[PDB]
Design a protein around this ligand. Structure first.
Ligand SMILES: CCCCCCCCCCCCCC(=O)OC[C@H](COP(=O)([O-])OCC[N+](C)(C)C)OC(=O)CCCCCCCCCCCCC
Ligand SMILES: CCCCCCCCCCCCCC(=O)OC[C@H](COP(=O)([O-])OCC[N+](C)(C)C)OC(=O)CCCCCCCCCCCCC
Ligand SMILES: CCCCCCCCCCCCCC(=O)OC[C@H](COP(=O)([O-])OCC[N+](C)(C)C)OC(=O)CCCCCCCCCCCCC
Ligand SMILES: CCCCCCCCCCCCCC(=O)OC[C@H](COP(=O)([O-])OCC[N+](C)(C)C)OC(=O)CCCCCCCCCCCCC
Ligand SMILES: CCCCCCCCCCCCCC(=O)OC[C@H](COP(=O)([O-])OCC[N+](C)(C)C)OC(=O)CCCCCCCCCCCCC
Ligand SMILES: CCCCCCCCCCCCCC(=O)OC[C@H](COP(=O)([O-])OCC[N+](C)(C)C)OC(=O)CCCCCCCCCCCCC
Ligand SMILES: CCCCCCCCCCCCCC(=O)OC[C@H](COP(=O)([O-])OCC[N+](C)(C)C)OC(=O)CCCCCCCCCCCCC
Ligand SMILES: CCCCCCCCCCCCCC(=O)OC[C@H](COP(=O)([O-])OCC[N+](C)(C)C)OC(=O)CCCCCCCCCCCCC
Ligand SMILES: CCCCCCCCCCCCCC(=O)OC[C@H](COP(=O)([O-])OCC[N+](C)(C)C)OC(=O)CCCCCCCCCCCCC
Ligand SMILES: CCCCCCCCCCCCCC(=O)OC[C@H](COP(=O)([O-])OCC[N+](C)(C)C)OC(=O)CCCCCCCCCCCCC
Ligand SMILES: CCCCCCCCCCCCCC(=O)OC[C@H](COP(=O)([O-])OCC[N+](C)(C)C)OC(=O)CCCCCCCCCCCCC
Ligand SMILES: CCCCCCCCCCCCCC(=O)OC[C@H](COP(=O)([O-])OCC[N+](C)(C)C)OC(=O)CCCCCCCCCCCCC
Ligand SMILES: CCCCCCCCCCCCCC(=O)OC[C@H](COP(=O)([O-])OCC[N+](C)(C)C)OC(=O)CCCCCCCCCCCCC
Lengths: 194, 194, 194, 194, 194, 194
């Protein structure tokens, strides 16, 4: 995974953002992108390769992995990062538009404050929504056994996941990181309210 | 995949482009290249390795994968990115040609406006065409079962795809991204019309 | 693993840090990140692939690897690096906040000294805690044999780990590096006390 | 594959080259190197791994793959890129030699025009030759079945290729790119003739 | 493996070092890091995957690889590089400390000469020690056959190593590089003595 | 493989080198390093994995691959590049030493001419020697069949190589590149003689 372009744009955002937003961006880079790269991807590298079902039926492991894990966890977290980053991109775009206008003619006020606050609200909504969606897809514990009754599987088969404990650890970790980001958005909103 | 050269040229384009075009380029980089790298490629890494057919015939899995997936989805999306980027390259080339002419002698008007509008039209056509072609090759849902009657397969065989649900998710996602890009081209054209 | 962003921020910290802290950061980069990348990851690449159990039961190898190694060692060390780096990030953030304030108006004293000392204390606590947690999960010797009685394993099965001696070597090495970092934090605190 | 050095030298060439040559270099980078990296290599990754022959003879798959694909397609395209890039390197070398001479003493004319035109001719010859050679090795359609009668294969065996349709697609695509480059060289020569 | 940070710091050292030390650093980068990356790692990639024992006992290959190769050769060379680089880091740290002091107030003498000479001595000791340790672990020839009598192996089993001749070649090569580095340290010490 | 450091140093050499030497360095980078990376490594990736012997004896494939290919071809070419690059490093080191001396006080003549000519001679010797050594290890054609009578192989066994034709192609190609480099060294020596 290459996050260099997003990294550059978010650094530009960091130049124009509140201290709490600088903290939020640092959290994003260190505790979500860095981990997703260094640690989580290796854990999920063999999710399907080391997924074993007790059956001789051709095709049952495939459909039962697809049923157990409709979307992989690491893939969901990628999308979460992207969608909680988008509003900051919108905000910095608005800011640079106004700066370009200034240059053509020749500190949050007016439209920039409305846009910044609205972007905080959007990040909050996206984050809450991704947490909720995760909870409904998988909850927050991967059990080692998965029982599957999807055709072509005869009757109910037993299947076994790779690394359920490590995956549970990282699921809970990323949830905690998301909640911290949420608290930080709340702090931004409070600070502004004052 | 290395997109650094294209990234540089498209940043140069971004220096010379309308706000809506800046948004379009941001979408291109974040929601198509970044995803294709970080997420989709891992999903399609084992498309043929974990593609199982119920048969003892040597060669049937190979021909039935070739028949089920004439071109892989990720490979089609690569080409889509390239072809919708080409017109912007043409436009910036024309612009830098005129700037070089200016320098030799020693803000869209005349040929640059015609070229920019024509490039918007080309991007629109390419995008619509790729969407249509995808729909006819695969539609927008990968089913888990594929029935195959291609020689050397005896009679009709059953074959099973890896990760059909995740792939359906990402297919729909990329379709939505393409439609957003299309709406943005429409906004460019309207803005200019005013 | 990509540590470039953290590397940049920690270099900025290095610009503003005591000689002992510069040494600590050099240790962090050379004896923990560099090793974890170059050496340890190759050792742990086949932890589950070359993990063999004497059984015909489907699913027993998976659950017995999950039981033997709840979290992989390399994954634990990643998190250790991140958490012992966080306080330095907080400290440099505070410092740059005060510098930005100075610029708006137009050498450790006051809040910066309190914050720096408190950050040293936090690094010390995190380091000690990670060492302790490692000791309780695995101790400091990976034995070649692991006996497993987790369902679906019939009775107690014998299982065998890949590369236990090399892994023991690197476990002890990283422990020694952590203890050196701890001694360096102590030296920082003493130097300041004078 | 790392093309950074060649990329740098060809950018230097781009600084000193006609508009049509700038277009040719853009084509080279985007439609040949970028594709070969992002798309074609993944298609050819399992050319021999997923190449199956109907036989129990040890060694027949190996010799029959060597016979079916004497040189892999992606490897041929690498060499094509290199050889059509070489003349531009010669041209820019000549140019920088003359510039260095100018500096020692203290816009195509004379030897630079002869060299540039001769380099266009060389690129044209190399491109035509690679197209022809490809046609004679493989034509432009990979069939799914390959019949092989090379020792140690008993009688004639049947063998099956991985991804023949996708490979045919990319073969035709790269052929079209080569023909476009050829047309561009023709345009250069015409422009100069005027 | 990423050696960029160490590379940067050692370039800074190169700015402040004797000609013989510049040669030593060039040797380090070209004949140890470059080789370890480009060549040796590919040789050792399948050390355990292609390590075959003549037995049906589950677990015997694992314990017999662990016994034959307690630590892999490439992993030992990584640590050797790191430990022979550390003293140069100490020396440049001392130097930059004194330069920072100079700046606060506003060519090897005094403490810098003592530190530089002591660092040469440390590199010499570490290098000699790593050579000796290698000799005692493995000597300098990997034989193709390894006989193993470690539980659970019944009686004495025969096991076979991957690529023993290539590995012997690279072992001897790296030994010669180490001895050259040693001679260079001797030359440094002599030059200073004059 | 990472050749960035060597690339930088050789660019510095290019700043101080004759036109023929600039050509030689361009050849080195484009026709040896670039190819070895992009093309040859993929060809040799499965040299041992797809090396099949007709036998049930455990250990015979391993010893017969070690006997057929004592050192892999790509590994030999790595070392060839390094050793033919070393003299240029020596030459630029001598040059920068003299420039540093000049600076302390405050166009090939004297020691620099002797050193440059001697370095050309060294490159010539190393190149000729590597060509000769290759010829004696393997000649210049990899045959598909290899007959092996090394213990534990019973009697003489038949073994089969992966991709012998592609490998023969690249062997001949690299030989031709080496001979071109040799001709270029001869041209350097002649030019100087005048
Ligand atoms: C931008 C905003 C994004 C929001 C995304 C929300 C996603 C909600 C997914 C709900 C999936 C239900 C799946 C299911 O199988 O149905 C649950 C059953 O069992 C049950 O619990 C039945 C009751 C289910 C209650 C579900 C409450 C959803 C509240 C969403 C609030 C989002 C706030 C942003
Ligand atoms: C922008 C606003 C977006 C709003 C989106 C609204 C979505 C509403 C979904 C309603 C679904 C109803 C049908 C349903 O309930 O389907 C049930 C089906 C089976 O479930 P099962 O537990 O019975 O069997 C085992 C499931 N097992 C294998 C995963 C463990 O599959 C499921 O669970 C359903 C899982 C649904 C997950 C939804 C994730 C939404 C994430 C939105 C992120 C927005 C960011 C801006
Ligand atoms: C630069 C422009 C690129 C355009 C690319 C268009 C690609 C169209 C591919 C059509 C494949 C048909 C395959 C097939 O098997 O035939 C469909 C049958 O079943 C049927 O539906 C029969 C009726 C099929 C109607 C097809 C309408 C195509 C309209 C294309 C419009 C493109 C606008 C840009
Ligand atoms: C610049 C202008 C370009 C115009 C291009 C016009 C192309 C016209 C194609 C006409 C094809 C007629 C024959 C046909 O219809 O062949 C039917 C054949 C079988 O199909 P089946 O469903 O019966 O069996 C299962 C198919 N299954 C395995 C994929 C699910 O294969 C197919 O489906 C045919 C799929 C055709 C996909 C075409 C994609 C075009 C993308 C153009 C992008 C342009 C960008 C500028
Ligand atoms: C930021 C601070 C992070 C601190 C993290 C501490 C983590 C402690 C994990 C303890 C796991 C016990 C697992 C177990 O199975 O229980 C041990 C049994 O066998 C026994 O030894 C029973 C006695 C166990 C004594 C445990 C003493 C823990 C002291 C922690 C001190 C941390 C200082 C920072
Ligand atoms: C910020 C403050 C954090 C405080 C955290 C407090 C945590 C308290 C944990 C108490 C656990 C009680 C239950 C227990 O004891 O569970 C026993 C269970 C089995 O163990 P077994 O030996 O009987 O069987 C074999 C184990 N075998 C496979 C690993 C070899 O699993 C175990 O061992 C338990 C291992 C526990 C490892 C805890 C690592 C904490 C790292 C904290 C880092 C903080 C950084 C800021
Ligand atoms: C900066 C601080 C650096 C600290 C480095 C600490 C290194 C600790 C090495 C511990 C080796 C334990 C080997 C073992 O637990 O085995 C036990 C097994 C019964 O009997 C065996 O198989 C043993 C066979 C012999 C193994 C020899 C391994 C030598 C590794 C030298 C590494 C030097 C690194 C600097
Ligand atoms: C720098 C220039 C590079 C040029 C590279 C040309 C490569 C030609 C390869 C010819 C391979 C023939 C293999 C074969 O098996 O023989 C063909 C038979 O079946 C037949 O068709 C018999 C008639 C074959 C006619 C071949 C005409 C070759 C014309 C080459 C023109 C190149 C212009 C640059
Ligand atoms: C600088 C000037 C260079 C001139 C080079 C002249 C080369 C002359 C070659 C003459 C070859 C005569 C013998 C012959 O004809 O051999 C026939 C043999 C079998 O062929 P088959 O079809 O009967 O059996 C199946 C073949 N199957 C497996 C590939 C499908 O193998 C073949 O096909 C032969 C394939 C020949 C491909 C030649 C590619 C040349 C590329 C030059 C690029 C220059 C760039 C500057
Ligand atoms: C910073 C300095 C690092 C030094 C590292 C030295 C490492 C020495 C490892 C010795 C391992 C012996 C293993 C063994 O199995 O024992 C050898 C038996 O067979 C025999 O030869 C018995 C006689 C063994 C004589 C060993 C002499 C060691 C001299 C070390 C000198 C180091 C100078 C720096
Ligand atoms: C800073 C000062 C450090 C001083 C370190 C002193 C270390 C003293 C070690 C004394 C070991 C005594 C027990 C012993 O001798 O164990 C014998 C055991 C078996 O050996 P075997 O041949 O009978 O069976 C086959 C061995 N086979 C599989 C490898 C071929 O394992 C062995 O060989 C033992 C191998 C020992 C290798 C030691 C490498 C030290 C590297 C230090 C680098 C320092 C850098 C600053
Ligand atoms: C820096 C200089 C590096 C030079 C490297 C030279 C390497 C020579 C390797 C010779 C290997 C012989 C292997 C063998 O099995 O022996 C050949 C037998 O069959 C025969 O041909 C018997 C006669 C063999 C004649 C060998 C002549 C070698 C001439 C080397 C000239 C090098 C000039 C630089
Ligand atoms: C700086 C000066 C360096 C001078 C080096 C002088 C080296 C003298 C070597 C003398 C060797 C005599 C014994 C011998 O002849 O051994 C014969 C043995 C078997 O050979 P076979 O054909 O009977 O069986 C099959 C061989 N098969 C599997 C490879 C196909 O293995 C062989 O072939 C022997 C291959 C020898 C290759 C030597 C490569 C030297 C490269 C030097 C590069 C210098 C760069 C500065």
């Amino acid at each position: 995974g290459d996050w260099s372009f997003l990294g550059n744009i978010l650094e530009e955002v960091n130049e124009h953002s509140t201290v709490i937003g600088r903290v939020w961006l640092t959290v994003l880079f260190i505790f979500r992108i860095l981990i997703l790269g260094t640690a989580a991807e290796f854990v999920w590298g063999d999710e399907q390769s080391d997924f074993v079902c007790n059956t001789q039926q051709p095709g049952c492991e495939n459909v039962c992995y697809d049923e157990a894990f409709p979307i992989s966890h690491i893939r969901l977290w990628v999308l979460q990062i992207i969608f909680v980053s988008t509003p900051s991109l919108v905000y910095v775009g608005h800011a640079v538009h106004h700066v370009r206008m200034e240059e053509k003619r020749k500190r949050l006020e007016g439209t920039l404050l409305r846009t910044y606050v609205c972007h905080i609200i959007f990040k909050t909504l996206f984050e809450v929504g991704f947490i909720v969606g995760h909870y409904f897809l998988y909850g927050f514990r991967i059990l080692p056994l998965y029982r599957c009754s999807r055709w072509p599987c005869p009757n109910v088969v037993d299947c076994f996941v790779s690394r359920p404990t490590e995956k549970t650890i990282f699921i809970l970790f990323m949830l905690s990181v998301a909640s911290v980001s949420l608290f930080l958005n709340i702090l931004e909103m409070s600070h502004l309210g004052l």
